[PDB]
From a paper:
The production of selenium-derivatized Hjc_15-6 using 0.5 l defined (mAT) medium supplemented with SeMet resulted in a total of approximately 0.8 mg protein after nickel-affinity purification. Eight Se atoms were found in the asymmetric unit with an occupancy of >25%, and two Hjc_15-6 molecules. After solvent flattening the mean figure of merit (FOM) was 0.59, and after automatic model building R work and R free were 0.33 and 0.34, respectively. Based on the observations above, we may conclude that Hjc_15-6 has a typical archaeal endonuclease fold and a dimer organization that resembles those of other archaeal Hj-resolving enzymes.
The enzyme, termed Hjc_15-6, is encoded in the genome of phage [name]-6, which infects [name].
Numbering used by the authors:
A (entry chain B): 5 to 28, 38 to 90, 98, 100 to 150
B (entry chain A): 5 to 28, 39 to 85, 98, 100 to 149
Amino acid sequence: KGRRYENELVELLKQRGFTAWRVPSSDVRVMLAGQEHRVEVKMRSTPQAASATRILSKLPFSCQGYRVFFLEALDSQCKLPKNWVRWLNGAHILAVRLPKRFTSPYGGLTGWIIVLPDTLWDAWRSEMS
Amino acid sequence: KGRRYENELVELLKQRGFTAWRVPSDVRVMLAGQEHRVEVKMRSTPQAASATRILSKLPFSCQGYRVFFLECKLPKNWVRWLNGAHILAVRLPKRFTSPYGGLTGWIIVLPDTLWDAWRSEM
């Protein structure tokens, strides 16, 4: 019910050591540096439907103040994809879910792409491991 | 640390049917399907909380806010605490609130827009 992917994202984040939860658009929350952040969740069936076709091979990259990376990626890091700024919808973290069959050949095992502010990248990396 | 009272407020809100939690405005509450920060203040006497004249007037509406025990102009000290946040929860010793009907010791200062959603979550 769309909530399926929000719950999947919350479980993947809790598995990586984050304090994350769901709240009924349907929104997700995450604790970074001791602060709560809204996470917008978008699911698309193909990389073309998510405007990620050219992006997949370029991850992780920093563009327009945002770091764009696969959820499952700690590797060291321009305009941003078409509907992504529109999908952020006032929030500062965006989580895009594609079928794993499309992301896995580029190293995205879970299917998730995270669009995080570059100011939050330090706190994000220091929550894991 | 005053986390003791934030936990007490979260339990009282969950008991009344609300989805409330403390952040690891440290308190959050779900109203109409939206998350709201709740500012928590604990004071030892009604004078320290600017509630002396208020206790007998609850529940009242004042300056766009519905002031009531958890179960006209607002004090300028409450207008500073409620600024930033939207909901303010003031905790006094129950010995002061109980003769006025406040068994728990908590006073909630909620916006008028949120009163509909608050009443429909009980």
